[PDB]
Amino acid sequence: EDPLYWGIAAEAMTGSHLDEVKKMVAEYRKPVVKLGGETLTISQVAAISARDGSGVTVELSEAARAGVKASSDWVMDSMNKGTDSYGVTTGFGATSHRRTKQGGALQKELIRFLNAGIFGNGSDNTLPHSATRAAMLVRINTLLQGYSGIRFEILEAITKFLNQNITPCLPLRGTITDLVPLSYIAGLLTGRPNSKAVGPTGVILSPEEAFKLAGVEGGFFELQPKEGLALVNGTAVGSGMASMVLFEANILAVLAEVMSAIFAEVMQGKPEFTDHLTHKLKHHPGQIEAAAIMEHILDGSAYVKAAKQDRYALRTSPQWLGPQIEVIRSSTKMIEREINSVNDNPLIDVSRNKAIHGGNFQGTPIGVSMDNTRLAIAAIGKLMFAQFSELVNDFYNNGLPSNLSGGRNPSLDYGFKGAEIAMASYCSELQFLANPVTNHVQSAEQHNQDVNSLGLISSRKTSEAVEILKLMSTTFLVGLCQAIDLRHLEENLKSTVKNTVSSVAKRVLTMGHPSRFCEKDLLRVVDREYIFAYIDDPCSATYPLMQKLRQTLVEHALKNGDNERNLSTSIFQKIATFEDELKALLPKEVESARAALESGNPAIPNRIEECRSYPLYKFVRKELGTEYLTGEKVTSPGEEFEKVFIAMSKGEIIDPLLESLESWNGAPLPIS
Amino acid sequence: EDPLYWGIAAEAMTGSHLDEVKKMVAEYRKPVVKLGGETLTISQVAAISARDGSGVTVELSEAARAGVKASSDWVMDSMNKGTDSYGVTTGFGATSHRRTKQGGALQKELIRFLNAGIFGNGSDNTLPHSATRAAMLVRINTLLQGYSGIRFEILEAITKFLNQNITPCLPLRGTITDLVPLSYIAGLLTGRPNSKAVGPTGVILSPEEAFKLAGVEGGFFELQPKEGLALVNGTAVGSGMASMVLFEANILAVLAEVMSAIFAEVMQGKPEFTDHLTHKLKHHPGQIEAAAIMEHILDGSAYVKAAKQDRYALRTSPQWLGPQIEVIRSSTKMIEREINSVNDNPLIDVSRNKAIHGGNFQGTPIGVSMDNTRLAIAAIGKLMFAQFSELVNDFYNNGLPSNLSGGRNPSLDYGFKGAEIAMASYCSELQFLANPVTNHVQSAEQHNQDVNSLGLISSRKTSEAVEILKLMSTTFLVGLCQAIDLRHLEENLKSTVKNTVSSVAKRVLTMGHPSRFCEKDLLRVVDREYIFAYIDDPCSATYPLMQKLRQTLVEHALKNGDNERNLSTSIFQKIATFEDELKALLPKEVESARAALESGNPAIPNRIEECRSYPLYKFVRKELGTEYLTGEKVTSPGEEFEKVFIAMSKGEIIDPLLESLESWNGAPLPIS
């Protein structure tokens, strides 16, 4: 028994976040959005909001028509009897004491005075057309429930505008949540002289042109009583935009979880930070899930198979992301309820033969969910900035080059240093955007609206935060792929150094007849030393390779006892010879190895090919043609970022992201 | 000609910030604050606000009495003729349409209904008594100008309350700027039954007890027409607190400038970042002054005399602090005007025989100056956090121990690591506090007060920020003194290592008969190496001293040519002997040197004794008894922080701070 509907809401929060995202993605890709008033999802809003030629269409449920007609007939019938009804024969808001019997004239006036927005020139003060399409879809879904008193034919007209991608121009600002912007949809439907629409290629259209292109026949609508109020008195603009925002935010949270694991891989972090006991003992489900996802990536990693504590951006990443995922998930359910709500006033209850006055236009679920989600996005951004900062810092990245520089000459390759500065600027602006909107409520409309939600303004700020998080995710992802390629370079160049030191050691020290403990210790120097600390000038006397090799020969000479006092068996007398032979040979050997790797024929294959995270690397590197960055070529990091950012904004990252987890059974690895 | 008073305001911003602070400090210490209505400074407010037994007294200018009596007589005379006057025979605010001829009864009612604050139990909802004293002083200064229509005897009564440290209890909250809190001063003067005061030792007093202790004779006042409005209708609580805040903020900005220079000293930064050409070419006077002050400290530094680029918290510190100083200075002039303004309504103009209605109670200068100053305080804090972070990090602090650890065993001394975490918590809360208050205005009082300044709320938040900045300054200052002592330890232990290496080198290598290029190169190793990288275990084979000493002997052996092939002149055959003699001798020599330094008899004196910054170190170390922190003793960093924080809060840091600059002539060093 669930009289206040807490139970059905709680049921919607079972199962994993990842399974919800997989469902959202499948829903988004369906060819038809069937609207009945109560099954709209944020992924259907996101799909319809697109203006990218996907071909998705909207169709209205015929099962809804009778209820819609009933309340429309009720309103018309109550005019014929000549009663007194708010928004039908009375004024609006604080001025509702005015009376009139010109019902159609009142609705015409309503749309006129709500057309109070400012467009100016250009598009800077215009609502994005995708958000207008989202608003149109959500408004239809509300009106289909049959409590609003509007003709079904008007909903059919809005549906044609959606399906033919003919979009009314709406002002960006003007709403405290959505009378003013929704009145520009009504104005297009009634052919107001200032009404404008945009066609699929951006052409500005008159209302007559828009009706013709959309396939609306019958001329402009003449609003019947209540129909203007039914069009404008709801939360569709704020909730439609919040839906688009949350669709991307849910995906980006999964991307942040997977990139935390790929980060761990290339950093050679200790995978035990994902151990399920740690997360089980905190009970938080977002943290448990985030750990299990990272553990899944790491359990199928060829880098972990190649393995005092890691720093917090690695080791506390499940604790950090967990509550953000929970907020984004909870916020999604709030918005999904809002886009299926009857946000209108008054409500026509034909069953009780009366209009019910209330406050369902008050968009508080939008403002709250968008403020909370914006703070969650800023936190995901801050972690990404901290991880990126560790990745490019040679003090912390366990042997990767400073700046992830790629070329032979570090003096002419500063790698990701510019990107790192950009990442700080993204993170800083994201922390600014994290401030709430909903604590700035003004007592409005002659103090009739003395609380108001500010939902659309908050959705807009969260939309801006998501865009910045995509800039950060793009830059981080390209950095991770650079690091992957640097680990491949590292393993191959280390193997070449080992082989060269071994061949020289044999040839020079095979006397004093074979110095064998010496050769193995020299090889241990190579195993121990960071390749990128010396490989740009491997035989330099001031770099660690030659210094530690000599130190090893000296250590063996001091332990060589009596044999060291005979020039024929002296290890010390071999040092100058060893160093000369190595200087003559190691440079060209390192160059040949690097050239071979650059030609696609490395001695050791790139281990990423055997990792579960390979689909993301493969997509960035092979599908998108993003290239390894190097000061030896003219290509800038931004040119590579463009490829990933544009693909990300087209949804092309979704498939390789989910592919990286597709064999996960949804449970953590056993701890018993 | 200066008809809008821009010119006289601009004149107040000439001369250096430091000279203004020196004047403020002298003003604060004067024994008598003489009030005439128009010469009050923030330093006089700060001095009077103190409840620390300084003995400062207030006295009222007799020259003010005639104007005060004139407007008080005017109000009484306009009652006798029976006219209509706002706040005298009419209601208040939005209810000013009500009429009455009971003039005294109206003022009694005014104080009753404004007594709408909440104290609860304890002091958490009570205005601090120092801020109440500031408010009382500022209100007298306003009323002395003679435009308010109040009896001079009431001002004399408030003066006795100040001079005898009898303070009415005021609620902390209740004002949008200061009717509600000021009505509790009026309530004490009229003996309201709920009125309470506090004596000098905290005893709660009835109004009768308070009058007796303060020396007010004549019984409770019975307010004459307008007198209640004259007491409560002004900005004295917000501006009084802003004055106290800005007094400390001005001093702390000079402290931040000087600590930036001491930071540069102990970091061995390049002093050229203070070069006047750099700052001259930006024109900003705060930056030019901040550079010249730091340059003055550094020009008299015995550490700079002992000397690719420094990091931003050092090298951009004048650029960073400059605009903060300008904001604090500009904000000070705004508040100094406000505390000398006639913030009251209506104004009695006996010259024109009329009351002038206006808005001078609108405390916008307070809200703006306190919001801007709070952001400036957060910026000074952020720089201090960044400097402290560099100071304790061995990657960045040019040879100081990680954490500024002080004991012989770093495994049992983590120095300032706890303080560093605390500094992040201080900085984080300061950045939170930097948000403004004045963008949260509500339309208030039946929408009569549809804009309001929120000045006191903003002053309170800036007061909290200043307190945190004092926590940060205390912790940083103790860290700087720790670093000073570590540089003293460093120079002495390095000298001992050099002498020991030299004596061993002589004794062991004086054969092959004296290895002289060898000895000088071994000494160059000691000169080059960071003492704190090895001095806890100086003869360890895995530490850099023994490694680089051996490397030097090996390098000389490889250059020794034919003599190296004879065991009698072999340098390589001396290594094991050299290392054994050094291991037998260097440990006890280092210990004797450290013990001698710990006993006050170092071989090399502490160079701080010859620096211009010595007064601050001497005060912290000798006057306050703050001690060098070491894991070898039980004393915690917090115990030492307490000494400095308490002294700082008593103003005891002012004298050594200004002493460090007292020979500065106020100009930068020539660049031509």
Ligand SMILES: *N[C@@H](Cc1ccccc1)P(=O)(O)O
């Ligand atoms: N949200 C109000 C409708 C309205 C329309 C136009 C102007 C002002 C208000 P409600 O439904 O609460 O009357």
Ligand SMILES: *N[C@@H](Cc1ccccc1)P(=O)(O)O
């Ligand atoms: N600031 C107003 C005085 C007032 C006193 C008590 C209640 C409400 C207002 P004003 O001087 O503008 O009338």
